[PDB]
Write an enzyme that holds these catalytic residues in place. Structure first.
Site, PDB file in Angstrom:
ATOM      1  N   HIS A  11      85.477  37.954  -7.396  1.00 34.73           N
ATOM      2  CA  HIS A  11      86.452  37.174  -8.162  1.00 34.73           C
ATOM      3  C   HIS A  11      86.934  35.831  -7.556  1.00 34.73           C
ATOM      4  O   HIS A  11      87.998  35.338  -7.940  1.00 34.73           O
ATOM      5  CB  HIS A  11      87.616  38.045  -8.709  1.00 34.73           C
ATOM      6  CG  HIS A  11      88.483  38.675  -7.657  1.00 34.73           C
ATOM      7  ND1 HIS A  11      89.065  39.918  -7.824  1.00 34.73           N
ATOM      8  CD2 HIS A  11      88.885  38.235  -6.440  1.00 34.73           C
ATOM      9  CE1 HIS A  11      89.783  40.216  -6.756  1.00 34.73           C
ATOM     10  NE2 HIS A  11      89.686  39.216  -5.897  1.00 34.73           N
ATOM     11  N   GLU A 238      88.796  43.983   0.731  1.00 36.16           N
ATOM     12  CA  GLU A 238      89.269  44.246  -0.628  1.00 36.16           C
ATOM     13  C   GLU A 238      88.269  45.052  -1.502  1.00 36.16           C
ATOM     14  O   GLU A 238      88.610  45.458  -2.617  1.00 36.16           O
ATOM     15  CB  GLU A 238      89.643  42.928  -1.327  1.00 36.16           C
ATOM     16  CG  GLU A 238      88.439  42.119  -1.826  1.00 36.16           C
ATOM     17  CD  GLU A 238      88.819  40.814  -2.521  1.00 36.16           C
ATOM     18  OE1 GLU A 238      89.927  40.709  -3.074  1.00 36.16           O
ATOM     19  OE2 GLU A 238      87.999  39.886  -2.520  1.00 36.16           O
TER      20      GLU A 238
HETATM   21 FE   LIG Z   1      90.771  39.065  -3.982  1.00 39.92          FE
END
Ligand SMILES: [Fe+2]
Ligand SMILES: [Fe+2]
Lengths: 405, 408
Positions: A11, A238
């Site tokens: 992202h 993440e």
């Molecule tokens: Fe992120």
């Protein structure tokens, strides 16, 4: 209530930059955009009604109050201002009824949640979604966003993310509506954007992680932050969000696609996983799980004169609750008393909402979905005693109410 | 490291109102204030260094983003404006160290949390605290607030509050400082303040709840919200927070005191529990608990050029992070470019923090505790490319950095 599959996608805002700047012909971004093409095509053909969308916010809408699993329960979401202005995309619609049901199930399974609405979605969402979905004239599907607090440590263990996914699968399946749901997990892969180590990448680890995630996700369940950060850069850790999404899928999946590109800081990866349904009937039936999700408030309707502030009610009353909440702000409350109609003019309040406020219609506001504590602020600001409010709830004069005490 | 006991108390703002109006001699409020006295005295005699304080916010600091278990990790807390301005009380100090340790244990135990700083603590905390603790210049103890989202359903099951309390006990005991900690559970008892049922009370249930909480709390663990709301009123169901507190105490406790009064809408109740320590060793030792809580970040210090953004660093860098986060506001980021010095003089930034910003010292800010994503906002606002920031991190020229990349 059918999970058709899931996709995993980086992202980075660099994806949004290239797309907004029109780099579809660019010699570096051309093949990367072609990397997204199989997922984009799959979403267009399968036509999911809702995507459950797992991402993290980048200290934009979540900062002073930072939660581990924050479920977006609202009607719609627009791009957040990240300090560059609002990106010009239309608002994407939420799914409050799916969100509520999912919340009921997750809490029944003892995950502790956060609920949010009204706040912007940062590039965590709109970067990949703008490249994977057409959005010229609206978005083709609804979103249930789940923001994960992966930036401020301690964060939930990799296994917790995975267990969230497992409970999430059952919650979605047991949703009593005949709909198609896609699960998205975003972020990654390897990267570090801070400190003397900024620029770190590990392609060998990225390819291993992807294969393990596809074919043997349980093997990853003992990885610590340290493991993930050493191997994948601090921010690359993440990817636990990928585990959550992967946990929402059938134990066996078909990986329809995998791509990988590393032009700059972030390994830009995409994965497309086709759900394989369930091999064996689940450990608890949809009917049973539904009754378990319902257990806490079962028979609350028999408690008369009572309006439980459930997610549906919060969504219904959000505009007016938000408006009244601003009474905590000295400037706003002073305008509320001195020029309430100018305030009403500038707001998004509907005409019933304004009128409810105008008439000091206490009971009507509760019927409507205003939470009492916002009424209490309105009463206090207006120099109206709570006892006036309680008496009106009861449809009694104050001395009549006082007598009952 | 030592839990000395706990106290349960209603947190109605009417308590604060009566206190501030000096109703200590009122024929109604005199016995009620006499009811807080044993707890006041216990607190003054025992002197916890910290009170872990369980309350709920009444749609003030927690609204658009509403969490189940919100742990306050900040350095200090000021009374929140609830629509009537700020109450005239000194700030109470937090305990970022104990909250970080607690956070680490609870997460190791698979509790999903929230962390918050800087926002106001409302009457849920300050109403009963102002009455129970002297505060003419400061407060006698630090506080670790736990704000629970009991108002927007679904909320955690009663058993989850209790299990939270159970893990919280081990979290606090394993804290490696020799300090005394009290635990406060607040809210209740029976009441309902909204709808045609507004005005509901149930003294019979209130007394039974107090008895069971003190002597058979495990008998309560299966209670549904429906059941609690029928018995105690819709808002009286907040008593799940008393469960959390009780779960953090020894299995059996000594009830030093209890009182109950019902002057208006809310049953005002207080309970004082003396901890009896641990009869058996804990299933897992303190030493092992500390090891398990450190597990996720154990060895992180061997990763060079990396500055994990942990609770202690979030607390450290709060003011500067909060400042730079304001760059998402159109009016603020305009002033930042056009007139930063006027912005600095309105801020609560220290001089060195202003200096770090003035100098565009990216690596210095990172060392200092600014998170990368706030720097990213400052950079962009200023027309500075991210590559310039990464290069400054690496101590390289922009093209030497770009050379490490596969494409520019
Ligand atoms: Fe992120
Ligand atoms: Fe409360």
């Amino acid at each position: 209530a059918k999970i058709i599959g899931g996709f995993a996608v980086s992202h980075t805002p660099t994806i949004a930059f290239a797309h907004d700047a029109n780099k579809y012909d660019d010699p570096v971004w051309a093949p990367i955009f072609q990397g997204f093409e199989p997922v984009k095509q799959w979403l267009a053909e399968q036509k999911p009604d809702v995507t459950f969308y797992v991402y993290n916010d980048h200290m934009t809408s979540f900062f002073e109050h930072y939660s581990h699993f924050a479920l977006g329960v609202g009607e719609e979401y627009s791009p957040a201002d990240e300090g560059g202005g609002q990106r010009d995309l239309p608002p994407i619609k939420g799914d409050p009824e799916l969100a509520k049901h999912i919340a009921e199930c997750l809490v029944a399974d003892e995950f502790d949640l956060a609920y949010w609405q009204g706040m912007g979605l940062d590039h965590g969402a709109f970067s990949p979604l703008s490249v994977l979905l057409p959005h010229e004239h609206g978005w083709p599907c609804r979103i249930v966003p789940l923001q994960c607090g992966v930036l401020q440590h301690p964060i939930p263990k990799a296994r917790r993310f995975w267990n969230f996914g497992r409970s999430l699968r059952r919650a979605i399946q047991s949703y009593p509506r005949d709909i198609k749901v896609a699960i998205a997990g975003t972020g990654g892969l390897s990267h570090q954007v801070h400190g003397e180590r900024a620029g770190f990448n590990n392609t060998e680890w990225d390819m291993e992680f992807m294969e393990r995630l596809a074919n043997d996700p349980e093997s990853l369940l003992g990885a610590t932050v340290t493991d993930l950060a050493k191997k994948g850069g601090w921010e690359g850790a993440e990817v636990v969000m990928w585990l959550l999404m992967r946990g929402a899928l059938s134990p066996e999946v078909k990986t329809l696609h995998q791509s990988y590109f590393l032009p700059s800081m972030t390994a830009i990866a995409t994965m497309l996983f086709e759900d394989q349904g369930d091999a064996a009937p689940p450990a608890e039936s949809d009917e049973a799980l539904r009754a378990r999700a319902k257990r806490e408030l079962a028979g609350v309707e028999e408690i008369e004169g009572t309006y439980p502030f459930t997610i549906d009610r919060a969504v219904k009353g959000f505009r007016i609750n938000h408006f009244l909440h601003r009474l905590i702000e000295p400037d706003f409350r002073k305008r509320f008393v001195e020029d309430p109609e100018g305030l009403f003019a500038e707001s998004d309040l509907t005409e019933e909402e304004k009128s409810l406020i105008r008439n000091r219609d206490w009971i009507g506001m509760i019927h409507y979905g205003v939470i009492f504590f916002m009424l209490e602020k309105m009463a206090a600001v207006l120099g109206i005693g709570n006892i006036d409010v309680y008496a009106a709830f009861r449809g009694l004069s104050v001395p009549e109410f006082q007598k009952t005490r």
